[PDB]
Amino acid sequence: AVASGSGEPREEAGALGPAWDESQLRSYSFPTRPIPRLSQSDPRAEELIENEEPVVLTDTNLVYPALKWDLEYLQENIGNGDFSVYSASTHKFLYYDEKKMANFQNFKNREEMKFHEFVEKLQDIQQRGGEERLYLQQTLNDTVGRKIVMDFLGFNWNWINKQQGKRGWGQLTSNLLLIGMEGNVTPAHYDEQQNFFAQIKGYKRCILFPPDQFECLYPYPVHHPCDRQSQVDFDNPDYERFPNFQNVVGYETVVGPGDVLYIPMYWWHHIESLLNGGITITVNFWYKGAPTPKRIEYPLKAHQKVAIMRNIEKMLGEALGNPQEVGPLLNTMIKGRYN
Ligand SMILES: O=C(O)/C=C/C(=O)O
Ligand SMILES: [Fe+3]
């Protein structure tokens, strides 16, 4: 009963029926509990953010002008820039840090193109029945056209600037534009920055796990190209390699046009564009977190321990002269000593 997932789907204004239905949600092995949906003016929402717990805000007006966005308007106005477009064989996009692909030898799609090229490929695949999937993920730069600049100016900067300030966060590092095909899945990973995830078109189911479920989610090695992503395939979890995935409990919600999901720093998130829900548009706002206090306050937060583990992996990579030695050394350290 408390495993309520995203709950019974919302009704759209003017009796236009449910936004989505449970048939559009993929099916997974683990329980989940709802993320709260609150007004930005609600004290509890501020309490959640202050505490680095996720909340969905319903009424920020953060990206009000972008609500008109759709492929036709974007292609008319987004300029002649190149757009990074990731490709995939299945719904599951796994992403690669390319600087890290030298680290690792035994290793194996990004493509740059114009917006019109992107739309045409979707258009093609659509009327040709192909299985290929595409995800545009491009940070918004200055090539963008007159009307996009204008929309962007009309974002609710008063609100978000106030948050950055209330929270002591660092700088806004980027806005990423994401345009996905229905069914697209970004698998469980974590980011080291604070995120406002501003939904614009279509619906996305967001499954979050707290930083203290690191032991259940089995992130790739730091020097691996898939740094920060879970090794576990949620569709076919290998419980022999990943036994504690049997203990994983998530927080979930479905976001649509106008909702903002606060994804706290180091929270795992798994993001899926609803099946048969059409194309999805989202813009993220990433901020560096607050600086680390004084010296330290113990107990120590889960995300500080994650930070400790990343740094040990990184330093041992420098010291050994070879990221591949990390694992063999780590094992020599614990076997028969700490396990
Ligand atoms: O919306 C996505 O597909 C991914 C978002 C993220 O990783 O923040
Ligand atoms: Fe992310």
For residue 329, the domain's CATH number is: 1.10.287.1010
Q: Which of 204, 273, 282, 286 to mutate to test the pocket of ligand 1 (most atoms within 8 A of CB)?
A: 282
State whether 84 and 185 are in the same domain.
yes
Q: How many Å is the maximal CA-CA distance in the chain? A: 66
Rounded to whole angstroms, how far apart are CA atoms 54 and 78?
Answer: 31
Ligand 1: nearest atom to the Cα of 204: 1
Domain containing 198 equals: 1-295
Distance 96 CA to ligand 1 centre (A): 14
- Amino acid at residue number 139: T
Cβ partners under 8 Å of residue 224, min gap 6: 100, 103, 104
DSSP string, 66-81: GGG--HHHHHHHS-S-
State whether 316 and 213 are in the same domain.
no
Number of domains in the chain: 2
Rounded to whole angstroms, how far apart are CA atoms 108 and 247?
Answer: 31
Distance 103 CA to ligand 2 centre (A): 23
Ligand 1 contact, 284 CB (< 6 A): yes
Ligand 1: nearest atom to the Cα of 195: 8
- Reported resolution in A? 2.3
DSSP string, 78-139: S-S--EEEEEESSSB-----SGGGTT-SS---EEEE-HHHHHHHHHHHHHHT---EEEEEEE
State whether 290 and 305 are in the same domain.
no
Is 173 among the annotated ligand-binding positions?
yes
Cβ partners under 8 Å of residue 227, min gap 6: 97, 100, 219, 220, 221
State whether 322 and 184 are in the same domain.
no
Q: How far is CA 209 from the centre of its chain?
A: 12
Rounded to whole angstroms, how far apart are CA atoms 207 and 213?
Answer: 13
Distance 82 CA to ligand 1 centre (A): 20
